[PDB]
Amino acid sequence: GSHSMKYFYTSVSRPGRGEPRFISVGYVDDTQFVRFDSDAESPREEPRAPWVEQEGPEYWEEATRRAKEAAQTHRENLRTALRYYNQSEAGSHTIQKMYGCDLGPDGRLLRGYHQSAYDGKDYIALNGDLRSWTAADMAAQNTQRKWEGNRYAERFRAYLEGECLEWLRRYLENGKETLQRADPPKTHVTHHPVSDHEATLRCWALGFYPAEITLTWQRDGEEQTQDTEFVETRPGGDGTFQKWGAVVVPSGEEQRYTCHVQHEGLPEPLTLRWEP
């Protein structure tokens, strides 16, 4: 199976209240395993998964050092951004940076990720070829030329094919029971009268992993788009995920609708119908 590891950095400047706050989170697939908050009484790489907490002091000290270096880099990038966009030091700003690697079913580097946005909008992203860059504006072009001059993409590739992949495999091997086991969703259909002539059919999919899932509604085997509602997939709080999709139906037509659920943990795509 194909897996993935990703790091998410968030640096927020706060003029008058000290240095910019840096928050880093590490993910294997859809399972967070580490966190680093510069506002933490003891800024140090913390584990958020049992299959990482067993690592020696080296992992945490090194991880902490790297995290701090990253934070500082984001500060310098914040200031540099202040120059590029001609902005004040009294204003607050945000820098977001996601970067990771995907491990194919074989063991080779499938995909690579290194992208960053400034103040909510795209700044610069590493293309699928992992050799070219995409800048969203004039300012990001400076950074682009910079990284084209210092061979940044090449070094980052060296990282992907190196430490990233190896550590991803280490994680997958140290916690196969939680990372490699895809759990099927508990699904069920509910009925909620919205009127004496209309009703709401809600399809529930609970406690599944990973987050990848697909819920749909069908009227007589077709596909309903009109009068439908699908909520953003949400976490259960216990490492699982939830998702429901509802449709408004004329009272007396409930038995003409079918909910279809596609999930990795499911042998065959489920088809549910309201059964009170």
Partner: peptide, 8 residues
Amino acid sequence: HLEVQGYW
């Protein structure tokens, strides 16, 4: 954690 630093 990436060790190489990409400066804007």
